[PDB]
Symmetry: C2
Subunit: 342 residues, 2 copies
Amino acid sequence: GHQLRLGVAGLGRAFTLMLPTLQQDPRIKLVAACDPRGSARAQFASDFRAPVYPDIEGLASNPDVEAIYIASPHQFHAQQARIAARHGKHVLVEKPMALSLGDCDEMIQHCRDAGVHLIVGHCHSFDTPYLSAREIVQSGELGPVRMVHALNYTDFLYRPRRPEELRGGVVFSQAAHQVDIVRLLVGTRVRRVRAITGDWDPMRPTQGAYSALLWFEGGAFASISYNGYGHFDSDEWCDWIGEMGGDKSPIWHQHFGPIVVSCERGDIRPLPDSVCVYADLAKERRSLQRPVVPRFEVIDELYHAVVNEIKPLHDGVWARATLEVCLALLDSAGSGKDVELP
Amino acid sequence: GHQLRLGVAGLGRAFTLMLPTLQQDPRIKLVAACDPRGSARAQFASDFRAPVYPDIEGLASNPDVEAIYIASPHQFHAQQARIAARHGKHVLVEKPMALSLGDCDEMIQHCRDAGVHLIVGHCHSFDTPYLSAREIVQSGELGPVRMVHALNYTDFLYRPRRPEELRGVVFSQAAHQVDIVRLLVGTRVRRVRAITGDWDPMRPTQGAYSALLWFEGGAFASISYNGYGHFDSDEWCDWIGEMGGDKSPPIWHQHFGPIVVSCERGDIRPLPDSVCVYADLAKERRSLQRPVVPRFEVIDELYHAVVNEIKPLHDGVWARATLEVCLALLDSAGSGKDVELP
């Protein structure tokens, strides 16, 4: 009702990254969890004094639950969503939505049939610096976007796996964030993608880096780069604030690396603690407000979806489009060809 | 001999940018100039008490001249080189060498026939931070290069034209960038794919681009450039300018924007005042020595070419290869297709 009664499916990393949000936002009440391993069930039931269950069917059958946060691994998203929706519970799914586009269509459809909302999980595109810059672009103040430059040098490939674990892989975890932000900011449709991947650690044999070109409806283009072999660290170019808002010399907004938005009449630079605008007149650090609850913008989007029926932006149709770009990206780097999108 | 007796053809901007170098390097003696405009002839003859001439044929006919610095506009490079070489004078040509590849072949040939050196002019790839990082790559210390990321946000499109200027980001700006990536990666460019932007109707040229570059051996590079002068990337080079000046109230090395070199075992970041190395063990700011003479590395390359017969790196064969990439770049952005390079 006033307080949103929320179930959590899958008590892993995604969940522990989200947990400070769920604890601190007074709109949220955590009522019920499920997870296959009892060690974790015993752990949630302890801390929250709340019914835990082996599976989704247990969690969705509880009538106190209003919505479920699906934080399990992706091969399980489509199945878990279908179930939640069957039992009429709204769905916030961590990224990526799913593995395949068919999976996504099924998800969007099952959620329509139940008349419940489908919002895709935490995504860096929810972060308010980017939300703020989207507003500048919409306001027309600087004309349309013509070019976007995005890069991010992380150590994602060599982060110790956490106890809660449960099993996100540069293109499916990291590229989704990036693509998502560029889509948010430009605000038109991706028409063509061309990408190169790098894979140069034999010990750790995955695609740990890429560079890509992205073509947009209306003539803007974007260049996106990512490296996760953890040498150079691009936070240095974001006022030394971390992905989760901490200081790296009272925390700040979440962000996902240096991004420069080139519009007709100026450049926009989103920071965790401001938005820099470079224009024909002057150059400005436009102030932002310290977030009182981390990732509150995810909860706003859910809370206004459920309580006030306001269409959420990061919906299933949206999340799906990102997946498409990520698939196209991976396909382009795999063949040696451009990929055109419908 | 001991002191290199140098002629200058074309007393424009290229020349005035080079002038502090030529005055201050004790190896260099300025003996003679030519230029079509008397106002400039009168000006050089005054300051340097030296014979000036209407054209190249005047300058090259003077037997005191050992070598000529060709700083005229490019449509004049090939004809001027042929002339200097006919009269057996070595040739330092400002960038771009020429506008055509046929022009370049003629130039390389005319200089071979005369048995004189052909070095291409000031190019940012001569700058010692980049030279120093090339050495790290050669030393094998970090394995081969796997990825290069290069960007540069300038105001090149809206720089007042200077008095001297004998009055365009691909042949001036992209050459610098391509050149550095070629220096650092150290193999051959095999494929290029590029997008240009052109979004100011007042100033209708290609003022920005992003490109992918494929290399022999599997490294890839991403290069971005924007010259509509809003954001200023010097912010990401310790606030030092292109010509080594400080831009945040004794100068430093020349440079051409943020560059990150990704090798197998670590990242290399050339700065105007150091080279940062990020490796598996630690991360280091490796110190460099202040330049006592700006662009001394250009003079080293010339002086050791003429006096001691040491093969120069930025030779005619080399400069030419860059042009190829620049042509490929422009071609790719013009059609919508990859360009493969012999």
